[PDB]
Write a protein that binds this ligand. Structure first.
Ligand SMILES: [Mg+2]
Ligand SMILES: [Mg+2]
Ligand SMILES: [Mg+2]
Ligand SMILES: [Mg+2]
Ligand SMILES: [Mg+2]
Ligand SMILES: [Mg+2]
Ligand SMILES: [Mg+2]
Ligand SMILES: [Mg+2]
Ligand SMILES: [Mg+2]
Ligand SMILES: [Mg+2]
Ligand SMILES: [Mg+2]
Ligand SMILES: [Mg+2]
Ligand SMILES: [Mg+2]
Ligand SMILES: [Mg+2]
Ligand SMILES: [Mg+2]
Ligand SMILES: [Mg+2]
Ligand SMILES: [Mg+2]
Ligand SMILES: [Mg+2]
Ligand SMILES: [Mg+2]
Ligand SMILES: [Mg+2]
Ligand SMILES: [Mg+2]
Ligand SMILES: [Mg+2]
Ligand SMILES: [Mg+2]
Lengths: 208, 99, 100, 83, 127, 116, 152
RNA sequence: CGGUCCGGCCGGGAACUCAAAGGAGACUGCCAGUGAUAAACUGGAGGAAGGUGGGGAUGACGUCAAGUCAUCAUGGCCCUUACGACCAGGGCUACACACGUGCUACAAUGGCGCAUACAAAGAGAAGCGACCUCGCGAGAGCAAGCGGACCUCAUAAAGUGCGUCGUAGUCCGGAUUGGAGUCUGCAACUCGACUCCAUGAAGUCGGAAUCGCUAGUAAUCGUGGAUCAGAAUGCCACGGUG
């Protein structure tokens, strides 16, 4: 293994964080623990709906969860019922008075997490992995991103030896530190094992 | 005087937050000294990155706490209620003390 | 690690924060300069009668997500591999790669 | 070494067992896992069956052992030789 | 009357105030011979006033902080040359020939990872 | 010349020649010269018998060669006949106070014996 | 190197005399970075040697070094089955380095009391055309004079 | 400038070091020659730095069935009143041997004692712990300041001045061993660190071979942090001479 995390190398310049707050040297670990509890809870619950990102933000002794999702219909459902049903239990998990903001994403076949869970769920319901990859690749290209590179890996539907496929198209420079490279990965649980999916999507270079 | 000491993680956000507090305090009170900077606390960490065995494979990370100090020398009766009313931005900690 | 080990560390934190009082009591009565000598003997003996798992020096610092014993970091609460995974996903604030 | 201000160290059950056995006065082996306890002169003249990990090795206490903790007379490892 | 120069070196910051005088080279509230215990360091202090003929023509007032003996002395030299180019302004070609104005851009190199120092690797061996 | 029954060197300095006895080292020798009033800048040459009388009294106040060798031999013998862990380690001939013996115990194991 | 043609390295002269040759000599004498003790050694040695010989330290050190400068040196070529050891005309800045290096190596190999006296005695012998440095120069030069045939 | 308890120390003062934030700046820009009118190179006047200024970060498609099922996740198999648990004690620290990586040395460019000067980076609340008293010391007791450009860790050392030592197993080296101890900790025997007194092994520059390094590098000297109740000759960093 060689490469760098392409989100972590751009955590400073172009990509923002996923948990922005401040602590002393005394409550830093407990902030991390309650953050990770609400992250695992939110992912496990609204995994049927397609979340994309979670901005955990705790301004001044109250928590705030901004859920970037694509389909708000399974997040909300009826007239603001399940969102408060989630909000009281986020307050229950973190122990703090709470807030939940729920935001949409436009073009839900362009972010890095959504394409990855699409290929993941298709591989769980047992489609051809080449059809899954090539479908997602040409969907992102006709949606108009500059680049996409997808890569599935391991136990590819009927093998004992585990090869690693990747397709690129467009242009997607990774050693550029000023690009906008949405990277994310995911795991498919099949009875052939764990099939790993990674996807880079280059949206556009950003200037100073 | 009430001294204001603002600690944060992002220098853009801390500049915007001290800008909003200095203009809100300037609108009401008188004799704000200035948003001075203090030494940025550069906490550092070294992690082995291999899960089993490589001593020669390491990353090093920093948490760069930026820290500003804004002084208010002549508070009126209501600037202290203005700042205790003022909800400050998400990701900036503040400490205020008269004396 | 094993789930018995994680619950074992929860047992240790429970007994430590339970008997935080009596330990400071008997260690004052041990370490004080002017003290009744049989009271000092009784302080040592009652300090033994306390359960051994109620020392703060007995709890190993586990990870707070996977219980890996070696490779802790106190300002994060997580092990080194999980803190690399979380820091590169971006769940820890202000944590970029230290280039100097 | 143990600090002089704390006195010596002997745990509750060996101290009580020693005092009961010296108030009675019998010669049976006092079976004892407490390897770390400082020998008192009220333990002089007794057989102490110190656990060495594997078995209960016996020591017959004399006047010379007045400060030495009990595991000095009980080698934990076993080394015959390499030849 | 006075002139100002900031000199910098490895970790030394020097403040030099040049005046016309008789030879008083006073550095941080103690004399030059009481400050520097090396004639090489005193040489590095008085080098540009050896290039020009102003050894006893001009006094000064010098503070310095940080660094070491030679680092402090090199910072003194840099501040003095900056102040002389502030003073007569015509010795720019002379100080460029002397190689004194050129701010010494060397620093302690940072110890990298896996290496015992800045560049020394440990004892590699095939077995 | 003689101090506590054993000769000391003559041309050397005072405490450096007084360190040449089994039992008085540099600190105890400095304390001896402090109690004697002879400062430590004199040689053993040009010292008179009154000063050697003071030194002999003050040195015999301590525990020096013969009694110290009885002390150490009786202490090691006590450990060995007691049969404690340090006694067992002394009669084996290995490092006592907790060193390692996978390598580097050569002060107690002497040279490196071949296996042939 | 292979690509770079690197020139020389500027070293500041001594505060005593201004001699770049003495700057090179105190650098070659100094070990473990402590320049001050080697400065004291070379200043004491030139002071006492000029006090014996009469004349200045600069002229005395220079002529006793000129009596131990090499003229042609030896280096391997190997190309047959045995090692050719061809002679090479030295460079006019490298002969200084060889002279001071052999002098300080003979001074370290000497058996005197202090290194000031070691350098003093070795450079007085190097003025009187005797000593270990002089014999080393003469034997390196005589090996080059033997292998004069490989001036191909 | 004032007032000086002579200590930036109190009125101050925006000039300075400094602390950040925003910038300007270095790009073959200018010149000459070579060069195919080109790419480019050899130079040099300017400039704080001349050609990538220096250092880091960034590790292409892939190779080695490389490593980890013991961070984690997981297909299958195996265990299920036990291969799962819980507790006490022991072991992971053994030792006729061999290797790897380091530290201390073998000394006079040095050792010892007495004074004297110059840093950078950091870390601190179950914590850092001044000042003052006691102990030769490790430390003890009292205990303000402090979430800290505020106080504490904390004296930097090599260096400088003087004295001494006289090339020796030495005033080198410090191992090992006995006694006496302080701290941490329920608990220092196996099995901690450190202090004091004493003891003072081998070693007098290293065969075959082999390694690191091109400049603030090598070499040498100190200091900190993480882990951490206590436990680094390591690891990660910072400066000093060079
Ligand atoms: Mg990498
Ligand atoms: Mg598990
Ligand atoms: Mg522990
Ligand atoms: Mg260095
Ligand atoms: Mg290593
Ligand atoms: Mg290796
Ligand atoms: Mg080898
Ligand atoms: Mg002795
Ligand atoms: Mg030019
Ligand atoms: Mg140029
Ligand atoms: Mg690059
Ligand atoms: Mg394999
Ligand atoms: Mg157990
Ligand atoms: Mg181990
Ligand atoms: Mg005292
Ligand atoms: Mg001396
Ligand atoms: Mg010798
Ligand atoms: Mg010694
Ligand atoms: Mg001693
Ligand atoms: Mg010998
Ligand atoms: Mg190189
Ligand atoms: Mg620490
Ligand atoms: Mg520690």
């Amino acid at each position: 293994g060689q490469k760098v995390h392409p989100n972590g190398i751009r955590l400073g310049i172009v990509k923002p964080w996923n948990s922005t707050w401040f602590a002393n040297t005394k409550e830093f670990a407990d902030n991390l623990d309650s953050d990770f509890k609400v992250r695992q809870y939110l992912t496990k619950e609204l995994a049927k709906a397609s979340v994309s990102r979670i901005v955990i933000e705790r301004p001044a002794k109250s928590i705030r969860v901004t859920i970037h999702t694509a389909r708000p219909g399974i997040v909300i459902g009826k007239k603001g019922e399940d969102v408060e049903k989630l909000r009281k239990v986020v307050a229950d998990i973190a122990g703090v008075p709470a807030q939940i903001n729920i935001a949409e994403v436009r073009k839900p076949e362009l972010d890095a997490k959504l394409v990855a869970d699409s290929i993941t769920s298709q591989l769980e319901r047992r489609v051809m992995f080449r059809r899954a990859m090539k479908r997602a690749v040409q969907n992102a290209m006709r949606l108009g991103a500059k680049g996409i590179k997808v890569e599935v890996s391991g136990r590819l539907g009927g093998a004992e030896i585990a090869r690693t496929e990747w397709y690129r198209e467009g242009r997607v420079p990774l050693h550029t530190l000023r690009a906008d490279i949405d990277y994310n990965t995911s795991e498919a649980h099949t009875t052939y094992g764990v099939i790993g999916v990674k996807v880079w999507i280059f949206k556009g270079e950003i200037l100073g | 005087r009430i001294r204001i000491r603002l600690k944060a993680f992002d220098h853009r956000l801390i500049d915007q937050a001290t800008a909003e507090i200095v203009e809100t305090a300037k609108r009401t009170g008188a004799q704000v000294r200035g948003p001075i900077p203090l030494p940025t606390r550069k906490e550092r960490f070294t992690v082995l990155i291999s899960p089993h065995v490589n001593k020669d494979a390491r990353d090093q990370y920093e948490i760069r706490t930026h820290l500003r100090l804004v002084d208010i020398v002549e508070p009126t009766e209501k600037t202290v209620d203005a700042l205790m009313r003022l909800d400050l931005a998400a990701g900036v900690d503040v400490q205020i003390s008269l004396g | 690690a094993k789930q018995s080990m994680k619950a074992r560390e929860v047992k240790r934190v429970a007994l430590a924060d339970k008997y935080f009082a009596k330990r400071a009591e008997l260690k004052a009565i041990i370490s004080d300069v002017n003290a009744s000598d049989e009271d000092r003997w009784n302080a040592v003996l009652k300090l033994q009668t306390l359960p051994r798992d109620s020392s703060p020096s007995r709890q190993r610092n586990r990870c707070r997500q996977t219980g890996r014993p070696h490779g802790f970091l106190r300002k994060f609460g997580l092990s080194r591999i999980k803190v690399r995974e979380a820091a590169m996903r971006g769940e820890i604030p202000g944590l970029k790669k230290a280039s100097w | 070494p143990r600090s002089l201000k704390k006195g010596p160290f002997i745990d509750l059950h060996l101290l009580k067992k020693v005092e009961k056995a010296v108030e009675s006065g019998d010669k049976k082996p006092l079976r004892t896992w407490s390897r770390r306890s400082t020998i008192f002169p009220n333990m002089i003249g007794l057989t102490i069956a110190v656990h060495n990990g594997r078995q209960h090795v016996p020591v017959f206490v004399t006047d010379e052992m007045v400060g030495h903790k009990l595991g000095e007379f009980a080698p934990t490892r076993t080394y015959r030789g390499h030849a | 009357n006075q002139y100002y120069g900031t000199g910098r070196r490895k970790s030394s910051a020097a403040r030099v105030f040049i005046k016309p005088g008789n030879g008083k080279i006073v550095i941080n509230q103690r004399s030059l011979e009481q400050y520097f215990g090396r004639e090489t360091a005193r040489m590095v202090v008085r080098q540009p006033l050896e290039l020009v003929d102003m050894v006893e023509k001009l006094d000064l007032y010098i503070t310095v902080k940080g660094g070491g003996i030679s680092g402090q002395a090199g910072a003194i030299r840099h501040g003095i040359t900056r102040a002389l180019m502030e003073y007569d302004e015509s010795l720019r070609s002379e100080l460029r020939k002397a190689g004194f104005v050129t701010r010494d851009a060397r620093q302690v190199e940072r110890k990298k990872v896996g290496l015992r120092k800045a560049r020394r690797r440990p004892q590699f061996s095939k077995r | 010349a003689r101090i506590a029954g054993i000769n000391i060197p003559d041309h050397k300095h005072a405490v450096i020649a007084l360190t040449s006895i089994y039992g008085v080292g540099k600190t105890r020798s400095k304390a001896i010269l402090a109690a004697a009033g002879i400062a430590e800048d004199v040689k053993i040459s040009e010292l008179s018998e009154g000063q050697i009388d003071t030194l002999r009294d003050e040195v015999a106040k301590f525990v020096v060669e013969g009694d110290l060798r009885r002390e150490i031999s009786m202490s090691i013998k006590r450990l060995m006949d007691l049969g404690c862990y340090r006694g067992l380690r002394h009669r084996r001939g290995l490092p006592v106070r907790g060193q390692r013996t996978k390598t580097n115990a050569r002060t107690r194991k002497g040279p490196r014996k071949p296996i042939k | 190197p292979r690509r770079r043609v690197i020139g020389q390295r500027k070293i500041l002269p001594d505060p005593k005399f201004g001699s770049e040759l003495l700057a090179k000599f105190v650098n070659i004498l100094m070990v473990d970075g402590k320049k001050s003790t080697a400065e004291s050694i070379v200043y004491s040695a030139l002071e006492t040697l000029a006090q014996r010989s009469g004349k200045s330290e600069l002229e005395a050190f220079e002529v006793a070094l000129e009596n131990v400068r090499p003229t042609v040196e030896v280096k391997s070529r190997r190309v047959g089955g045995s090692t050719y050891q061809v002679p090479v005309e030295v460079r006019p800045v490298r002969r200084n380095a060889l002279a001071m290096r052999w002098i300080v190596e003979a001074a370290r190999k000497r058996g005197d009391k202090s290194m000031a006296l070691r350098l003093a005695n070795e450079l007085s012998d190097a003025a009187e055309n005797k000593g270990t440095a002089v014999k080393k120069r003469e034997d390196v030069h005589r090996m080059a004079e033997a292998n004069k045939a490989f001036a191909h």
